[PDB]
Symmetry: D2
Subunit: 192 residues, 4 copies
């Protein structure tokens, strides 16, 4: 009750996972991901469920940075082509809709970045760049972690934080500031 | 990739700060309101709308009757319900307008916001303060690493998942209980 | 500005609505209603513009007092063998919709297909097939495709059919507009 | 077994589309087309079912080669005074749509109102008032609302009008179905 111990324990776990990401992120792979995003004609993003919401948050920021970007399945998304890149977000790398769409994109000839916790997954095996962002750590039991962070919550939070870190890095590389992003952000529903 | 790693360091500092300062009394009031509602409605604009949807989906997994404002199957809000509005500034126009209409109907309102005396907070029954930009943080370095609402958004997402962990404990739920409810058609 | 193509499109739509009314299988309509009315909940799905039609229909089913969800949306729960899935696809071959519908059938849900193609993958797996055509028998394809590209005519005809179905269910349930008003969302509309 | 309300609804819809074909203001249509073509980008919005219609139309404008966005969606950028907003609202009083349109007018964007009410709040703000009515002169409200509740007839008429407008723009631009096929999304359809 009043102490809300599970709330606090969850936050401790999040702290440990962000530290883990800091200490283990593959910087070479981050560079390869940035290179594909920069070299593509346009960027398409996809995830299912909560990973879809992360994909949308990332796509919105790429738009703020000045990229030509779309979310798969959304209204104004045009035909994907062999000059584009698809970024698929799936913790397991087995998410059926994301795997099926990514296979179709690969057959068209688009490149694929997989943001996933599983380097050996169906999605990762198809990918040009496999950006590994773990949910569960080596030393953790899944059953214990899932009591605080069910259904892949930890992967989703870590992937969100990673993608916002990637935005920070791209801003630095492109000498973009907050004011640059502000010029592109939507204002009709927020009022600035 | 120094800026990437510096961003992660800032997020680390911010989560430590959240851990130290979360108002546990207000958390209890928020949970009480969620539990007492007939239906729960959630709303946010832009990236905060994605946070709102992530939280609504988890509430559904936890067994609540829950909807996202503006979405297809969302029914008429009533004075038996609770609206949860997510807005970093507490001044987001669409969220303030919708929340005022909900209050006129008689719904209860939880504001998840960084500004305790914002328009949104002033209307709310429970003001759940979650801050993005911290007290005396160098606005210049933070804005460059974490532009627009980025820090508030990550902090709110982390807080709402922490709230889910708390509710699971209070209801004695395990992952399998949530797995029974989750949608499988797209995920597999 | 005579806008002759705009006016011609409207004339074509009227002919298609008359064609739908003249040829509709009223028995299949009854079977669709029976599945909707006996389901624990109704799930709907379509890709692209057919998805927008599915969402319009789902919203109206909610107004009629059904428990209803859109596949892939935020609060949609696990589908079960107590439910019915309504899939909308002009060709009946839309890959995402076929794949989702087959998964639903494997779980044991019932399936209604709203499609232009009675022998398509989606139609052949369905419990009830509502055949709503795009091109008519004596209609030149090249004309229709210029005025109504990419399945526009199937989509309009399917939307009109589904609103007609709502009118029917309202009558059967003795509902008026006021009953639906009690359930419709007001926060964005006022 | 006869589904009389279903069939009557279809008869009424076809009469409404004939009514549209004979009462539509072609001058206003031409003004709408001119704004769509002169705008840097087109933004569309509607609430609820009218939002689904807005998305269907935005998708088609994308197929035609326009730069187009749906208000509130992920990749939609800041609207400017060089853009046009198309707002769809049957009553013209839809609060969310009116509020968004007011902000767009403060920025200086042009506004097209697709509405049934020429003196509504939304219409009064608009550069072009594209009147598409749901109820006909001689119709009784209580009768139409039983078959077509909550603005159903406006919504169908507006959807059909916007598809007719697309047919007209294709003709004026010498576009064919194959041109639109080049641009349409394929991942979820196959």
């Amino acid at each position: 009750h009043g102490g809300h111990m599970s709330l606090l324990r969850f936050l401790e776990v999040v702290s440990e996972h962000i530290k883990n990401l800091r200490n283990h992120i593959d910087l070479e792979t981050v560079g390869e991901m940035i290179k594909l995003i920069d070299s593509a004609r346009s960027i398409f993003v996809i995830g299912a469920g909560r990973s879809g919401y992360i994909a949308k948050a990332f796509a919105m920021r790429l738009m703020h940075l000045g990229y030509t970007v779309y979310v798969v399945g959304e209204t104004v998304t045009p035909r994907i082509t062999d000059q584009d890149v698809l970024v698929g977000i799936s913790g397991s790398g087995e998410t059926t809709s994301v795997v099926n769409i990514s296979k179709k994109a690969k057959d068209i000839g688009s490149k694929l970045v997989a943001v996933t916790g599983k380097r050996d997954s169906s999605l990762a095996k198809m990918a040009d760049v496999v950006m590994v962002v773990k949910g569960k750590m080596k030393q953790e039991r899944d059953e214990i972690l899932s009591q605080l962070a069910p259904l892949g919550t930890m992967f989703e939070l870590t992937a969100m934080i990673f993608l916002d870190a990637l935005v920070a890095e791209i801003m630095m590389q492109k000498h973009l500031t907050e004011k640059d992003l502000e010029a592109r952000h939507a204002v009709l529903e927020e009022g600035g």
